[PDB]
Design a protein around this ligand. Sequence first.
Ligand SMILES: CCCCCCCCCC[n+]1ccn(CC(P(=O)([O-])O)P(=O)(O)O)c1
Lengths: 334, 334, 334, 334, 334, 334
Amino acid sequence: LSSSLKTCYKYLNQTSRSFAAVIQALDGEMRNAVCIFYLVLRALDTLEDDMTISVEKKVPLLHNFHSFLYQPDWRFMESKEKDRQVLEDFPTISLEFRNLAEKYQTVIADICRRMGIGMAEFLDKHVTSEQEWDKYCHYVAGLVGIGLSRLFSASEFEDPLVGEDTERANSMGLFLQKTNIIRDYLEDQQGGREFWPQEVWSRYVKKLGDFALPENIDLAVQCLNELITNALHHIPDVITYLSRLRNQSVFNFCAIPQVMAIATLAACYNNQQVFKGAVLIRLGQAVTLMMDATNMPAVKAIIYQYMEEIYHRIPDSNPSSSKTRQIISTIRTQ
Amino acid sequence: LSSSLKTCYKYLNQTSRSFAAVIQALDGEMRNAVCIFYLVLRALDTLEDDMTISVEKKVPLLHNFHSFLYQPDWRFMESKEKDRQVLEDFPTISLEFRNLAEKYQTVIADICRRMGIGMAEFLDKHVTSEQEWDKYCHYVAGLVGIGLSRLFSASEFEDPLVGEDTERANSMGLFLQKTNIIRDYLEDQQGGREFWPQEVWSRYVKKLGDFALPENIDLAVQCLNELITNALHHIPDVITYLSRLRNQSVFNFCAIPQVMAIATLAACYNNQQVFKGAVLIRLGQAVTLMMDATNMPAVKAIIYQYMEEIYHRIPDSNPSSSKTRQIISTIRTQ
Amino acid sequence: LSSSLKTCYKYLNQTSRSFAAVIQALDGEMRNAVCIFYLVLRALDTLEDDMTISVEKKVPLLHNFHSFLYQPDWRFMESKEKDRQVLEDFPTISLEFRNLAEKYQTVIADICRRMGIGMAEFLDKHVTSEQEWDKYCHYVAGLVGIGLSRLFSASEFEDPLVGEDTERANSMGLFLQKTNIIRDYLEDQQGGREFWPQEVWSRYVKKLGDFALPENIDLAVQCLNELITNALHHIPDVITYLSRLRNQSVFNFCAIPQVMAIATLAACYNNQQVFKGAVLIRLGQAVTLMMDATNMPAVKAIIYQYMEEIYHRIPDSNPSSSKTRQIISTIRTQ
Amino acid sequence: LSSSLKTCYKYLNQTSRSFAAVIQALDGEMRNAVCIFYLVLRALDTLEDDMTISVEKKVPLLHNFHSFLYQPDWRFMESKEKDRQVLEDFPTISLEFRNLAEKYQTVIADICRRMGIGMAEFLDKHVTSEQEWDKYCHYVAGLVGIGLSRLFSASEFEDPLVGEDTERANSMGLFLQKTNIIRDYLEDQQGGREFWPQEVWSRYVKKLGDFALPENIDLAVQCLNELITNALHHIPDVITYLSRLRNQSVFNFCAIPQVMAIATLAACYNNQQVFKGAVLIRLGQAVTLMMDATNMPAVKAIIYQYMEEIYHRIPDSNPSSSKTRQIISTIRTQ
Amino acid sequence: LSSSLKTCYKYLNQTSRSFAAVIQALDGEMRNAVCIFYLVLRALDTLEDDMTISVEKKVPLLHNFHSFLYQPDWRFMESKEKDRQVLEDFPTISLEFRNLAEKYQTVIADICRRMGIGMAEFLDKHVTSEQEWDKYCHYVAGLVGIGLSRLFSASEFEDPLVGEDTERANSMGLFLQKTNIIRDYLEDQQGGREFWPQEVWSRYVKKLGDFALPENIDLAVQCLNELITNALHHIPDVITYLSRLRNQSVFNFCAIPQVMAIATLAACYNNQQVFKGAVLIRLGQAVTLMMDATNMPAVKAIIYQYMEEIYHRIPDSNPSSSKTRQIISTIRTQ
Amino acid sequence: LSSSLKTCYKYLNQTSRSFAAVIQALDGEMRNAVCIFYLVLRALDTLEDDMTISVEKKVPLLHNFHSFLYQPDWRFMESKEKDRQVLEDFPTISLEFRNLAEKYQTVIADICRRMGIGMAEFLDKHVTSEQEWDKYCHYVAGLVGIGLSRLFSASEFEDPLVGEDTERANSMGLFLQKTNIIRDYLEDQQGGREFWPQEVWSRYVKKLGDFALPENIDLAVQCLNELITNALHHIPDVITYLSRLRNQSVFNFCAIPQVMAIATLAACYNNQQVFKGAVLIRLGQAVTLMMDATNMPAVKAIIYQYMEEIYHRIPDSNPSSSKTRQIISTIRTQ
Ligand SMILES: CCCCCCCCCC[n+]1ccn(CC(P(=O)([O-])O)P(=O)(O)O)c1
């Protein structure tokens, strides 16, 4: 019907290779709510990425983005980023945002407000400590998990307990983000962006860029393995979060991406290829090829299979070997 | 128990490459009702297929087929087709037909009667307009969908609405038949049959067979895309139909073929391979590799994913490009 | 919490390539109960396998194994088998066994007692009759299915009937054991172990080992098909058992191995490769690659498909051909 | 099966009028856990109650009571209290405690250690301030609510948030205790124990025992009303707590006592009978006489009705009148 | 939060002795929506009540009441009725009305309009025919059931069919209103209000008020029984309606009142007390004393028991004996 | 609609003091199916009760009763029993029976047959051993439970596992029957019928009627307790049976009768009143007066409370005492 809503779903598919389908498969009111949430977040993220926008011009844009949702004519025409159209045709997006029930608007605007402050905070600095890593990931992904959880509950398709558990919801976002940051080292490196925590990579090399030098491959993998081990600590929370869900369309939406990130970490673990090029995500063992990620018991088994894929490859010599076995042990035994 | 019922199930597995498994997995009374229904339709389809049966003899056979279901000793012994066994031993099958609850008999006979009349009508002509294309598919597949739907409701395993909404049920069949007709262009051409609507292909070449000529590949593909674009229009109905199902065994039976057809059309889209041989039914992206077609939400996501696969390949120079984008856009927004 | 329980799960993953994942996915109490059960069975199985332990020395260990579960310090340090770790660190396993609720201990201890008795029984004899084959399989697998079934009922996650029907539960074990025995012919031969029932292979050759000879390949496949035909008889019971399950985690745990077994039999049927090396278990038709083994209707479909995969490869000449067709027919018509 | 567990349930019934039935009705694991938890707390409570034991001998016992749980032979044979049997045959109870899953053991032991510390602390003093009243109630009731919530979560029959939100769990306990303390004024005076906050009753009389004086009945009722108004403040939390529950057996166990407590408070409100004898708990209005406390909405309705029963009888002349009306309004509106 | 909303709930508990509790127990948005709806209906009803308000001054107030919802300052200070508080502080109510999601406002406003119209229409006449009785009940209660039903569907806590089947919803209001009109005969007569249909009572006496004269007690009871029999015809629709509800909080809200109405009719049937004083609503047999009205099957059982309580007390010589038996027979059999 | 069906429901209410309401509350096809099943069962029982019918005339009526269901004009106008109307108007009943789906007919027919056979057998003898007592109860109550269970499963409102479990369905029946037999001793004696197992009452008195003698009150009570103790042994099965149920209407129907019987036994236990006059069924403690029997945990709680009510009154001086405690402790610990 609505031509503007049509445009939004067009944008959703243009900017989301890996979420559009599951988003469109969401039950009732969640469909549009999550679609709109994805688009405005996409716009806020594009603003953050655009390095052609000076920091002093970017801070206000990020700080006041949540208010733009209520400015019918607001738009940004100076972006040179690839997803710039959601910024250039933002009026069509904010229009549909204002068409959403108020309970959804409140959540989306709140997350944008907080995300903007968070992104602005890290514009002038690099992630140093692992604690700072969690903070950054909390700002660009954790809040997304929290926001989404609140939309699920406000829609009534999910229990109020889902949106209430902000800790676990934050973990869902932290896990996906860390996995992406780890996987995209080379890509981010070649792009002038540094996301790997400094207090970690500085124990291996002088400059993050050195992991890009073939003569430092050994040290690079060791660091890679330490970061992966860090990310695995979020899996217990992920499993707890998914176990609470009761709506199938919501379960598929939340589970598939977590399982893909896990498959991603398994393929990247102790993999020199992370620093040479792209890594191929292989489908799995025999038991996995018999199930898919659409029921909780099956999701656990698929995760456990991937954990052993890793556990099996842990080199006694890796300086994170014990930590890696420990967290995988915890995941198995829980 | 019954040896004749056993023989029936033997013939089902011998004559149904892709439906036998799901049919045998159907709950209660539906199992036998659908088994027999499949057997008589296959027998009817074989009569129509056999080019060694003169039109003079064929017309009466197709018109009166439905009544043979009531004649204990009727059988045909002159078929040369591969599945002739269901015809030569029709008494065994007709015997089991008469054992079904009267309510299922009504549906089965009614569909055979209408289908036979329909097949007789197309013995002396080819499909011309797109309207005739729908009419033809209605007779050989649409009615099959209507029949099955009415059986589902009659058995009470599915809501009355399932059997009542004949339009949606018809679409389910039309989508599969059109998809198969598109896929099998080359196999049918070498077989002496023409199913592609003449009013569509005549606007590209002079004879349908011209598409098999390496020098016409481009026009051939433009026609392929137009027809695929025609088939895509049934998807909203397929989704509506599937979303109404409540029985797991019925859901698997109905959803599996649909998703298969959809992946098939995605693989054929703008693919020149359609005119050189058989086409690869890929595997999917990552989001799909983690989902199977057993719950509505997952099916929607898989369908939406295949829709994007097609959307990504729509060349701007294709004369149907705008139409193809249009229908996909509607499927996303609904 | 407990580090001993963690060690147990470490052992589970070290000794079980294909069960660990689905075992860890079991709901609540069944998780640790099945884990521990798997581990004690594995310890008992290892003692049994060890050919460096004389029969006189071995018998008392098998007979009293169930009692060692209550000897806090008991362990066995003289094994050279691959999984000896579970025997050498048995106190860690029995400690957790004694932590399980008493109702579970009773079931596990009872199965261990009866299994040791049976295992002792066969230390000095080979399998002769087919009836002896069922008894041996009952001892090393059938009882496992009965034990597990009693754990499911006692946990209340499954109906009281699952545990009470020892016959259906027994068939579950027999089917997996027979399938493995059939598949591992060559590996067992080169190991000095013989499990194919003598009365069956003797009607084809003088020494079971002759099947390993290239010149007897024809008689080999014939024996292979007769045994496979024997195994198929448990499938009706397998299906009955699975259709009573109501817990999803227990369903995945029970269904997946049975399906893998069936896929294996289909692959081995009329295959010379069984006598030359490892057999490649391949994908499946189209209808199967669309579904996974996590819902009863889908499992039925998957099974029916493999049945037809065997059925239509049955050589007219084969001595069992008519037996094979008859059981498959019974499986479909039920 | 085991007579020691049978014996435990025997003691559970001898020592609990209003809990034994609902406790035995708890699903799976929670049954024995809560049963044992109840028995040990009853044993601890019996020691504390016994004025026959000297303070310097009682303190160490209360402090180390948690440790006896691990001492197979520990037992107390010098008590004169009615429920002395649980102390005399503690080995039976501790044996079963040690048979519970470790996760339950640590929760129970932890609560017993903390409860003992608080109990010892209040041996030589009475409740002065209202803040002290919460503290005393925390030690003898709040912690039980926290302990039970942790057990519910650990059993997985309830959400992780139930065991995490110790504040809400605490309120469940404080509400029941305060109510009982308010109700049992007379009974306690005649027993030599003082539980009404001195800082509260002191503003009305000179000695708590004066409310027992006919001539002071009016000051009494006013103090009664002030304390009840204090208790009514835990209701919002009680509603928050009960709203998170998803297991019916746990819901019954938690909701029934809360509702009875609220009925008791409504009956005692501005009732002189409190200072004369036992107060009878009425029938409830018409709306409540068609609803039982087994589903949250019904429980809410029941609670709201009792709130009105109290709101209707608030005397303007009462000094707490405004406060009372306020808390009720907050409960109504949330 | 909002002090105005707080005030609204205070008035709800002031003006509604029997709906306040279940309204406050409604889930999410239905809570405030229904509370406000009740308040505005109460104000409209109180205007209509005030005899101190001349006809030509009242008619406008009734017709334009639906508009005062949007007049921020609108308020009436000349009422003497007991619930005058809601008219004097109407802006507070109207304010909260405007805070509701428009989809709710739309429903409420539409009902207040159609209600004021009908109310106006009856200001100068009495109820003559039975058809006119239905019309009057439609206006003061039927429309209410429609409005509430439409609020439920718009909240989506209930299926769309609920707000769709206006006839069934109308029946809900008609059953309650008739029951109350029957029950409050004396109270209404003493107030100068006559709601019993003249075409029914004039067959017994000359003036409806004569039923208040002890000498006409027998005739009064006969008429009483005729009207009750009339009311019973709405029961089939009440059961149908309730059976479609899916939200527990909505079910309690709807079922409790209906069950209390049926119990009231049962107590009033062939009961002289109706004309002497008030009637006590009876416990219930033994089967009912074992269930509450919170689940459909239980509600049906309660309803059937009350029908039998009536059926057994039907006097053969009663003028409606056959009609009464007929409808109760219809109810049992459906 | 059907006037014959209406008449059927009139007889249900006429002949069934307690079950009518809950039977009419059953979902869909179970309603009529169970109503009709109750009527035929009542007719068949009335034939048996009629002592004016000679044994040689009675026997054939019983054995062939099951065939009368298909004999349209069959009826019996010679009964003097109070419920004779069901026999005289049997054609109305047999008519509606034949309107029931064939699946329901089979069960009812099958049950009547087997029940008639069993009733004939006991026409000339008395219940001797307790094993005989179970046999009799099996024929007049147990089979009813087996039938109902099958009707539930056949209707598909209850899982197939309910119909299958015959031993527990039997226990359900045996418990009610034994309970009524124990309660109606006096009434059965003054009626010339003896049902207490001779082998048990013979160890107390010479003639079962002696218990009616005030001089044997002590031996009477003792015998009473020994029988009640006997009955209690069915409770574990009763609890297991109900725990399996999933449909609410079926649950109320099954649960309520069992709770009443339990309450009955509780009131009768060690109560002389049994031999003097009608026994009264008490309220039930505080906790129970808070729950109804519509959810399994509440039912367990109710049962457990009544069990305590009996355990409390077990006199050490009784000779069954140990047996009584033993069984109750088992019902509690399981
Ligand atoms: C599967 C749940 C039901 C299993 C038991 C079904 C048979 C019950 C046998 C007891 N029985 C015998 C006579 N009655 C009639 C009973 P009623 O219809 O309420 O008059 P009651 O006189 O109250 O005991 C019941």
